[PDB]
Structures are given as structure tokens and as C-alpha cells.
């Protein structure tokens, strides 16, 4: 579980976020990897601490791995997988890429079957969104940061109500009662699909937080992204049934995906 820091190099940094700073290096002068520098007060440590055995197992092709933690001294580190495209939004609002509708739903399938082999070892995301995922130098998508809201400090980003709480990746019973559940991660699965087919446009890019909780509780959805075919965008659709478990599991949306592949090749 635990790697020596000193067995890393530093080489440049990669941005900012809950957790403070993320840098690019290479382990034992060889290995391509992604060190979060855990920012002193932002993360419940010792509780994370105590995750990272279990998420540790949790390997896939389609979820970044960790690779252990430098928990000795502060701050203390995260080891991750590196990915050389950087985070799928950025990547989604690079208009040259021009991506085809074949490549966008391979990157929904790439998402799909990370989620389904979490929903599998009954694991909650909590955040999935395509700021959470990243690309590797193949153009595959990953998906990361599973799990780790659990270990945030910051009210702002737990709080329903906060300032940088997923909001408009939450299910209704998400935002008026904390149910969180698969079917949770399912609704933002199907708003990951949407930022997809968008290209990285913001949901509900013309309401405010407060706007886009209120009307989703009324029955307003997110609508077809031009990219989306009648079938891809059913597939999104499927996804924010008002109730949860009418919603799809990550298993059924896999073999959706698979068939409309099929089917628009
Ligand atoms: C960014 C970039 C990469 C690149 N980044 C990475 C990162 C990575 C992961 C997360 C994050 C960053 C980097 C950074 C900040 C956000 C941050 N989020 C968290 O730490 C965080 N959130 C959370 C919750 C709130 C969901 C619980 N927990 O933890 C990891 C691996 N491989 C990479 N490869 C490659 N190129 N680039 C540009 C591309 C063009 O410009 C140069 C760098």
C-alpha cells in the first residue's frame, strides 16, 4: 500500500483541486504517474487511509488505478495511473479533435464499463462527471477520483446547497433527501452522456444551481445534443427517470451501448 516518496520524481504540474495540487512524475526514474499532493486540512485522512486498502483492488481497464500512498509525512501523497490527454472535459471542448459520433460513444462505453464493474463491487462514484474522468495517450477514457467525495472537508463542496456541490449531476431524490444510491450515479451517468454528445457544454447552461434543482424536480430534463442520435439520446434519457429504480443499471446501459453500436457503426 505505501510507496516511498523518495522513489519519485517531480516533473510538472497539472492543476489544482479539492485536494489541492497534482503533479506529473515518474517513479524509480522509470514509471509515468500522477502524485496528488493531499492539501493539510482538506481531506479526512486517516479515514481515506483506511480506503485506499480497499481501493487498492479495485482494477480495471477503464478506472485509473491507484497506485499506493505516501502517507508517512504531510502533506501526504496520492499514487495514481497517469494519463496523458488530461481531464475528458478539457478534451471534450478542443473543437480540432472533431470527433465522430463512433468516437463519442466509445468514450460513453469506455465510462459505462469502469461504472459497471464499480456497481459490481458495489462501490459509489458520488461524482461522476467528465471533469472526473481522463484520457489516456490511446484517446481511452478513464474514469477517476472514484469514492474520494466521501473524504472531502470543505462544506461548500458537500453541502446540497453548496457553492461546489455536483448539483446538476444529482438525481431529485439526491437533492431533496440524500438518497444516494447506484441510481445516483446512474442519473450522472446519463449527464456525463450529455456532456459527451455536447462537447463539454455546461447542463442547464442557461439556469443557476438554485434554477437547475428546481426544475429537474418538476420534470425538466436536459434535451437531445445535435450529435445524439434518437438512440443515443434515448439511452441519456433512460437515465433521469424520476423514479430511481426504474432508472437502468450500469449493466443494462453497457448492453444499450453495445446494440447502438451496433446499429450506427
Ligand atoms: C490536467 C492534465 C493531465 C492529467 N491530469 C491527471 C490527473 C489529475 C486528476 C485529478 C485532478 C487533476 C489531475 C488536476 C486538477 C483537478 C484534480 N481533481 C482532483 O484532484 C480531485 N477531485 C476529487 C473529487 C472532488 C472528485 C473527490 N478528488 O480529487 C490524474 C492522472 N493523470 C492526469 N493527467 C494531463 N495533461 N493535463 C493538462 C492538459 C493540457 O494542459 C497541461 C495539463
Same mark, same amino acid.
Given at each position: 500500500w505505501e510507496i516511498d516518496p523518495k522513489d519519485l520524481t517531480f516533473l510538472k504540474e497539472l492543476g489544482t483541486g479539492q485536494f489541492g495540487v497534482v503533479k506529473y512524475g515518474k517513479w524509480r526514474g522509470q514509471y509515468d504517474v500522477a502524485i496528488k499532493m493531499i492539501k493539510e486540512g482538506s481531506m479526512s485522512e486517516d479515514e481515506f487511509i483506511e480506503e485506499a486498502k480497499v481501493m487498492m483492488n479495485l482494477s480495471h481497464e477503464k478506472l485509473v488505478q491507484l497506485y499506493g500512498v505516501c502517507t508517512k509525512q504531510r502533506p501526504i501523497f496520492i499514487i495514481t495511473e497517469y494519463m496523458a490527454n488530461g481531464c475528458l472535459l478539457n478534451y471534450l471542448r478542443e473543437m480540432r479533435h472533431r470527433f465522430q459520433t463512433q468516437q463519442l460513444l466509445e468514450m460513453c462505453k469506455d465510462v459505462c464499463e469502469a461504472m459497471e464493474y464499480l456497481e459490481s463491487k458495489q462501490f459509489l462514484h458520488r461524482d461522476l462527471a467528465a471533469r472526473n474522468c481522463l484520457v489516456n495517450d490511446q484517446g481511452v477514457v478513464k474514469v477517476s477520483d472514484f469514492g474520494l467525495s466521501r473524504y472531502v472537508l470543505d462544506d461548500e463542496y458537500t %453541502? %446540497?446547497?453548496?457553492?461546489? /456541490?455536483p448539483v446538476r449531476w444529482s438525481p431529485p431524490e439526491v437533492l431533496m433527501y440524500? !438518497?444516494?444510491?447506484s441510481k445516483s450515479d446512474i442519473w450522472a451517468f446519463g449527464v456525463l452522456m450529455w456532456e459527451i454528445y455536447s462537447l463539454? !457544454?455546461?447542463?442547464? @447552461?442557461? /439556469?443557476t444551481n438554485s434554477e437547475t434543482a428546481e426544475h429537474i424536480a418538476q420534470g425538466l430534463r436536459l434535451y437531445r445534443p445535435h450529435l445524439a442520435s434518437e438512440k443515443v439520446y434515448t439511452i441519456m434519457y433512460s437515465?433521469?427517470? @424520476? !423514479?430511481?429504480?426504474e432508472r437502468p443499471t450500469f449493466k443494462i446501459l453497457l448492453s444499450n451501448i453495445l446494440d447502438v453500436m451496433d446499429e450506427e457503426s
Open positions: %453541502s %446540497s446547497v453548496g457553492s461546489k /456541490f440524500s !438518497k444516494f444510491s463539454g !457544454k455546461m447542463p442547464y @447552461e442557461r /439556469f437515465c433521469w427517470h @424520476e !423514479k430511481a429504480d
